[PDB]
Design a protein around this nucleic acid. Structure first.
Length: 199
DNA sequence: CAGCTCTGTACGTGAGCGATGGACAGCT
DNA sequence: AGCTGTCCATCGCTCAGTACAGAGCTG
């Protein structure tokens, strides 16, 4: 046996959830798939020592310094960034989640986005946008692409932006460096929106 | 046949944890 | 010089979505 959670069982973590960090007037809401074990353990967003989220946020220039999971509550006020997940239930990986859980998450998610109305809904993972698109827009494309989506959240001006998951489980974008392009394009989209709005 | 959905599988990089053993200091 | 134990550098093992082939299904 290997002690990964400082004496806390995996079974206890599987019962924990991760709070949303949402406010009104946000530029960005990072939508994770669900909490992984370390996120359920810490009660903070993307604490995975290998998770690329905080590294990509810094390397892209979305944060001026390298931040970590303990900084997640400062993001709404300082950077205009919030957090939620498509699915509430904690699991080791995306593969443990059922189609029903994802669709229930999708309905709750669109209601949250319609309430907070961030400038950009950022899907941190292709898999959750695949479900969201079919469920909310009734659209299923053969080749779903990353980046800006051609659909706004219904009854809002909220854009949908898709990125490969920040999880290092994903072999197709093996390093933080391979995902940073999407974070840079996110920053550019944010800056472009703030330019049009300011007169 | 030809699209589709569904499921099983393979995949690159970097980090914590636990085991290993060489360096070395304190003893006598 | 001989013994013994700690430190810690280092290594192996495990871990943290996505694309796609092929089966099964249906138009």
């Amino acid at each position: 046996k290997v002690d990964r959670f400082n004496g806390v069982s995996e079974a206890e973590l599987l019962t924990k959830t991760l709070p949303d960090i949402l406010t009104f007037n946000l530029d960005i809401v990072i939508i994770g798939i669900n909490p992984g074990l370390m996120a359920a353990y810490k009660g903070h967003h993307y604490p995975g020592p290998g998770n690329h989220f905080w590294k990509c946020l810094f390397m892209s220039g979305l944060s001026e310094v390298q931040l970590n999971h303990m900084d997640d509550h400062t993001l709404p006020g300082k950077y205009g960034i919030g957090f939620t997940n498509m699915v509430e239930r904690t699991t080791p990986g995306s593969k443990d989640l059922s189609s029903k859980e994802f669709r229930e998450g999708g309905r709750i998610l669109v209601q949250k986005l319609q309430k907070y109305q961030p400038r950009i809904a950022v899907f941190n993972g292709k898999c959750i946008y695949e479900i969201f698109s079919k469920e909310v827009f009734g659209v299923k494309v053969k080749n779903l692409e990353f980046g800006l989506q051609p659909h706004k959240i219904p009854d809002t001006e909220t854009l949908c932006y898709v990125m490969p998951s920040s999880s290092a489980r994903c072999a197709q974008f093996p390093r933080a460096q391979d995902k940073v392009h999407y974070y840079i394009k996110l920053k550019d989209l944010r800056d472009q929106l703030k330019g049009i709005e300011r007169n």
